[PDB]
């Protein structure tokens, strides 16, 4: 997901933690973050499989030449 | 003049026939030989087609063992 929308919330959150509209805006951005993350070792395994296909075919052509 | 052009355009005739008969026999021999050559060529082409077939079943076995 996008990582540029999170420090914007952290700035105001820092201000509130140091001290309705401020926390209201913070929540208004946090909802957009909720919908964003909701919309958006494992892949390694998958990588190998895809290449497995490529390797078998290369071996066949190499069977023709040799 | 058309008659002169036609009698001059006719194929080369001969007073004897042994030439013609000889030509016929020779042509027969050539026919037999070229037939045999055809047979051989057909055989070789068949062999090659068998080979590239073999390649194709290799590929099919590959993808079959692959995606499923």
Swiss-Prot record, chain A:
Sequence motif Nuclear localization signal, location on chain: 17-31, 57-66
Localization terms from the record: Nucleus
Biological role stated in the UniProt entry: Component of the Mediator complex, a coactivator involved in the regulated transcription of nearly all RNA polymerase II-dependent genes. Mediator functions as a bridge to convey information from gene-specific regulatory proteins to the basal RNA polymerase II transcription machinery. The Mediator complex, having a compact conformation in its free form, is recruited to promoters by direct interactions with regulatory proteins and serves for the assembly of a functional preinitiation complex with RNA polymerase II and the general transcription factors.
Entry's family note: Belongs to the Mediator complex subunit 9 family.
Subunit structure: Component of the Mediator complex, which is composed of at least 21 subunits that form three structurally distinct submodules. The Mediator head module contains MED6, MED8, MED11, SRB4/MED17, SRB5/MED18, ROX3/MED19, SRB2/MED20 and SRB6/MED22, the middle module contains MED1, MED4, NUT1/MED5, MED7, CSE2/MED9, NUT2/MED10, SRB7/MED21 and SOH1/MED31, and the tail module contains MED2, PGD1/MED3, RGR1/MED14, GAL11/MED15 and SIN4/MED16. The head and the middle modules interact directly with RNA polymerase II, whereas the elongated tail module interacts with gene-specific regulatory proteins.
Misc. remarks from the entry: Present with 1364 molecules/cell in log phase SD medium.
Protein name as annotated: Mediator of RNA polymerase II transcription subunit 9
Species, as recorded: Saccharomyces cerevisiae (strain ATCC 204508 / S288c) (Baker's yeast)
Shown residues in whole-protein numbering: 61 to 145 of 149
From Swiss-Prot, chain B:
Function statement: Component of the Mediator complex, a coactivator involved in the regulated transcription of nearly all RNA polymerase II-dependent genes. Mediator functions as a bridge to convey information from gene-specific regulatory proteins to the basal RNA polymerase II transcription machinery. The Mediator complex, having a compact conformation in its free form, is recruited to promoters by direct interactions with regulatory proteins and serves for the assembly of a functional preinitiation complex with RNA polymerase II and the general transcription factors.
UniProt miscellaneous comment: Present with 1391 molecules/cell in log phase SD medium.
UniProt family annotation: Belongs to the Mediator complex subunit 21 family.
Protein's name in the database: Mediator of RNA polymerase II transcription subunit 21
Lineage, uppermost ranks: Eukaryota, Fungi, Dikarya, Ascomycota, Saccharomycotina
Subunit structure comment from the entry: Component of the Mediator complex, which is composed of at least 21 subunits that form three structurally distinct submodules. The Mediator head module contains MED6, MED8, MED11, SRB4/MED17, SRB5/MED18, ROX3/MED19, SRB2/MED20 and SRB6/MED22, the middle module contains MED1, MED4, NUT1/MED5, MED7, CSE2/MED9, NUT2/MED10, SRB7/MED21 and SOH1/MED31, and the tail module contains MED2, PGD1/MED3, RGR1/MED14, GAL11/MED15 and SIN4/MED16. The head and the middle modules interact directly with RNA polymerase II, whereas the elongated tail module interacts with gene-specific regulatory proteins.
Subcellular location per the Swiss-Prot or TrEMBL entry: Nucleus
Signal peptide range: none
Portion of the full sequence shown: 71 to 138 of 140
Coiled-coil zones: 15-55
């Amino acid at each position: 997901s996008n990582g540029e929308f999170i420090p914007h919330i952290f700035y105001s959150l820092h201000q509130i933690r140091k001290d309705e509209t401020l926390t209201g805006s913070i929540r208004h951005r946090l909802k957009l973050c909720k919908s964003l993350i909701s919309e958006n070792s494992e892949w390694q395994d998958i990588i190998h499989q895809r290449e497995q296909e490529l390797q078998i075919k290369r071996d066949v052509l190499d069977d023709l030449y040799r | 003049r058309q008659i002169n052009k036609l009698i001059d355009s006719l194929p080369g005739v001969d007073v004897s026939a042994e030439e013609q008969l000889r030509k016929i026999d020779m042509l027969q021999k050539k026919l037999v030989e070229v037939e045999d050559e055809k047979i051989e060529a057909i055989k070789k082409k068949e062999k090659l087609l068998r080979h590239v077939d073999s390649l194709i079943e290799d590929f099919v076995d590959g993808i079959a063992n692959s995606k499923k």
